[PDB]
Design a protein around this ligand. Structure first.
Ligand SMILES: Nc1ncnc2c1ncn2[C@@H]1O[C@H](COP(=O)(O)OP(=O)(O)OP(=O)(O)O)[C@@H](O)[C@H]1O
Ligand SMILES: Nc1ncnc2c1ncn2[C@@H]1O[C@H](COP(=O)(O)OP(=O)(O)OP(=O)(O)O)[C@@H](O)[C@H]1O
Ligand SMILES: [Mg+2]
Ligand SMILES: [Mg+2]
Lengths: 559, 559
């Protein structure tokens, strides 16, 4: 156990459209207590819950928000559960597969599997989800579960973390009259039977749901009108002058007073709060090893299989492989019947392969992290997993299909053109082309993680790659000697220098075959200047270096 | 007036996970009548409302859904308003700007402006939106209006069309107890004061909201338990054997019977419905000029200014122009001090400009229609605007920034390299490069409209453009004569042939300057074979032809 006492004193919040959203909201909620935050629409009660959760800060917010007499630490955000108002889930897992991945990641690890699975399916039977558990969670384009079943998957998503402070933002909207009573009876058993601290906002409770709250907060356009016990609310407003004509729901009467339609009703109740109850609240706020490298790897295995079955359907594209294959038959027919002695044509084949496999991996990889932006952000604030195992699961998860496409391109082009016979110069050509595809993929990952949308990022990578083609070593013969150093930054340069070295070597065979346009051209472009091992040792430095800079760009995003 | 009588007889709906969602739902709602669809979560009442709206069809749905004794026609979907459960709005318009664009497009056109604007702001004062009207509607990443204010913008969005059948899917979820009473009192004034047909589903009504419905439908796992007047519901279930112990809300008692927790309750009430009330429902279902080209243009002007102020902020990028400018200084320095007589180097400059400005417009344009997919789909089913004025507003809206980038690229490169002096060969080079940018943009628009997401589509366009580079006319000298026809499909071919013709002409000056590698190379590649006017007349055929095929690919999407 780790009991949280929450305090918030004089919380204000301005925004620039200057509009005051919250102004002077003081309260305190203890462990063992279930509090409701009532109010009209726009009164500010999802800005107040979003500041005591720790997801709203800056120079707009002003006021002391205290969790056990201290600031909001990184330690206290691991014991806090926050169920937001909009639901962000994966559109391809089923309801049971969604709630097993949460149970394996977040439950105490010194606990056997098949007990973590009998915790995930005793939550399904408490929320009534045992009819749609084999149904896929959908989105706007994939039709799946209901809106009231999607709401209860998100509450189960936080009820499997076992929090110490549970903050919910309208959990009963979209639920009928019987499912909303049972959910409030569940949350009242956490507060009264386990000693937790539950804060919730709620819109249309019945007279039976309203009798289960220990404490009511009533907002009205950013200023509170009542803080105290729910069984004192109707007897407070009678002593100020307001009472219902016909007997009715007490939660219907308190929302007429907050709208001011209970027959200056609002401004009477604001200054009557600041002289009768507001001083006595701030008087009450004065006193009241090898088991560590197994948790990294098991988080990696869960995050792999979760992303392999996102791409199971909507993917396994034969369309990507039947188009790269037709482009390799197309290149192999343009250079059908070219000869080994024609050096000027063979170096234009080898430079087009460098253009093709620098442009194609790099432009595809710019979609990887921007297409995860809303769900990565939400799960980073929860504390689900570390970043170095989320990152490494996307490195290893892309690497299968990214290596089948260059290997099937080159099997057609190498033997139709009939470049150089032997199994040894074929496999060296295959492995240089697979090291260049991985170094070109990491350029697109780093620019998609720094710029977090794909339309803005796939403009920066198109101009950057066309500048690597220009300084890559084919287009200009004399460069101004003061711009010769720019080719040592280009990835395209080090691949094209390695493919020419496998085919023609260090001269010395074409120079005896071409005799010695025949012996002048083959001394600037065939002989070369960068060694064969330093062109390999720099494509490894761009392999690791472009994935380090993609990790540091994702490290920024925090809340 | 055009009164709609809605009927639906024996509606079934199966889905393949075989699961029966709806089975045998018979009802009839007349004009002047306000009907509520009650039920638990997952009982199927948003599948039933989504089939009588006309947005759900196929081989799964089976049953006669009739609107004035006929099928769902294209004419009846113009008089129908459907407020869905999730809200899809533009994240950059304010609340007032959202509701003025709807009033100008959808109100009767033979009606003066400043009366269409006093219709848009008398709806704001009926829904209580007169505090957030100057606040921007947000999204998940832009913080804007509330969730209960977003719900009422969507109801106002359909209350400005003046429908004849209004179908709403949970309109009071996210609203407090006083705003939910006023909204039901608004919808009851449309049905009883104007003679419309309102169908709504609703979750937790109070005892005062429940007394405003004329007709109740009660579902329970896809089978109806009661159809009839709301003031006969409690007296019906008493005569079968069910009655509340303590006096309570009648809408709370009917949801206990549908969940079966009212103390085989459900299966008793299903077979008691099919012998007592279900035969008497189907007995009742037996009887009961130049003003046309001004509406095209005013829809074009509203759709332009709506999309120009979506790109006002999040855009006006100096980042796109400061990077294209640096790439033009970079090209102009690589070919600084190259001479006019060196023909083999100048034709490698001119081919790199063809690569740069075919790849850059085409890859950016693949995001245009896929980033509008959810909102284009919703407004296409409403009948907001025609497609040929939505399409033409995106042609004219992109064309400003797409022509400033090639014109500022070429001002640096043409005079640093110092290609050919004269203002006349400069402007011919500028206009050929602007005709090729528009023809390359239309290739990306057609592949983004046919494939309706941008990650799948920006793989098809990368391999297609690298195949236009290969057959574009630089890489291979002898092609197998049986593949010479493929260059006449490439866009890159016709630009590169036009830039060589402006610089060197029809030979006849370099041949006297180079005397006659000097007179052999300049006869395959400088002389050329395609005329100067047929290279212009084919880039106009690919200009119009690639925007026709993008219109026909958007014509598919309908509901
Ligand atoms: N494409 C689908 N595949 C499988 N099941 C589906 C599909 N679409 C809907 N369902 C199921 O149909 C049932 C009814 O769904 P629907 O959304 O129509 O009910 P609802 O009454 O609107 O629920 P709520 O009140 O929670 O919004 C749900 O149990 C849902 O799981
Ligand atoms: N970034 C912002 N800029 C301008 N106004 C804002 C911003 N954020 C919130 N508001 C305004 O603050 C008011 C309160 O918003 P909030 O969402 O906190 O209220 P709420 O009680 O949760 O409403 P609901 O009950 O409808 O969900 C709203 O009127 C909203 O328009
Ligand atoms: Mg639903
Ligand atoms: Mg809100």
């Amino acid at each position: 156990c780790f009991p949280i006492t929450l305090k918030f004193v004089d919380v204000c919040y301005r925004v620039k459209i200057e509009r005051t959203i919250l102004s002077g909201v003081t309260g305190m909620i203890s462990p063992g207590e279930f509090m409701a935050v009532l109010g009209p629409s726009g009164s500010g009660k999802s800005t107040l819950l979003n500041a005591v959760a720790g997801r709203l800060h800056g120079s707009n917010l002003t006021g002391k928000i205290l969790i056990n007499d201290g600031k909001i630490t990184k330690q206290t955000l691991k014991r806090t559960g926050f169920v937001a108002q909009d639901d962000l889930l994966y559109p391809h897992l089923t309801v049971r597969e969604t709630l097993v991945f949460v149970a394996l990641l977040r439950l105490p690890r010194s606990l056997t599997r098949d007990v973590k699975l009998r915790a995930a399916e005793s939550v399904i039977s408490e929320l009534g989800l045992t009819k749609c558990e084999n149904t896929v969670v959908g989105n706007t384009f994939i039709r799946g579960i209901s809106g009231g079943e999607r709401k209860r998957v998100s509450i189960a998503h936080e009820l499997l973390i076992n929090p110490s402070l549970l903050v919910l933002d309208q959990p009963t909207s979209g639920l009928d009259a019987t499912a909303a009573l049972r959910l409030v009876q569940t949350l009242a058993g956490l507060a009264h039977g386990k000693g937790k601290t539950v804060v919730t906002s709620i819109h249309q409770p019945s007279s039976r749901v309203f009798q289960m709250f220990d404490t009511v907060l009533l907002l009205s356009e950013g200023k509170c009108l009542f803080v105290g016990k729910g069984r004192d609310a109707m007897a407070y407003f009678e002593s100020v002058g307001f009472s219902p004509a016909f007997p009715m729901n007490p939660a219907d009467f308190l929302l007429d007073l907050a709208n001011g339609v209970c027959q200056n009703v609002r401004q009477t109740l604001v200054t009557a709060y600041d002289t009768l109850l507001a001083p006595q609240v701030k008087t009450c706020i004065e006193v009241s090893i090898t088991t560590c490298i197994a948790t990294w790897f098991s988080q990696l295995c869960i995050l792999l299989h979760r992303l392999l079955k996102e791409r199971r359907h909507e993917s396994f594209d034969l369309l990507r492989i039947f188009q790269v294959v037709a482009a390799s038959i197309l290149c192999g027919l343009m250079w059908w019947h070219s000869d080994y002695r024609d050096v000027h044509d063979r170096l234009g084949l080898l430079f087009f392969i460098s253009i093709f496999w620098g442009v194609l991996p790099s432009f595809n990889a710019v979609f990887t992290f921007p297409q995860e932006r809303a769900i990565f952000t939400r799960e980073r604030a929860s504390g689900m997993y570390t970043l170095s195992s989320y990152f490494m699961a996307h490195v290893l998860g892309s690497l299968s299909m990214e290596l089948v496409l260059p290997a099937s391109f080159l099997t057609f082009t190498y033997w139709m053109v009939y470049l150089r016979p032997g199994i040894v110069p074929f496999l060296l050509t295959l492995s240089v082309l697979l090291l260049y595809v991985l170094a070109s993929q990491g350029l697109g990952l780093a620019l998609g993680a720094a710029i977090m949308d794909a339309k803005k990022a796939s403009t920066i990578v198109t101009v950057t790659m066309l500048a690597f083609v220009l300084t890559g070593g084919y287009y200009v013969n004399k460069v101004p000697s003061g711009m010769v150093w720019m080719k040592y930054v280009s990835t395209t340069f080090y691949c094209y220098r390695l493919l020419v070295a496998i085919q023609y070597g260090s001269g010395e065979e074409i120079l005896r075959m071409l005799g010695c346009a025949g012996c002048r051209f083959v001394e600037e472009e065939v002989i070369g200047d960068v060694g064969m091992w330093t062109s390999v040792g720099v494509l490894f430095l761009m392999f690791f270096g472009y994935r380090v800079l993609a990790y540091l760009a994702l490290r920024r995003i925090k809340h």
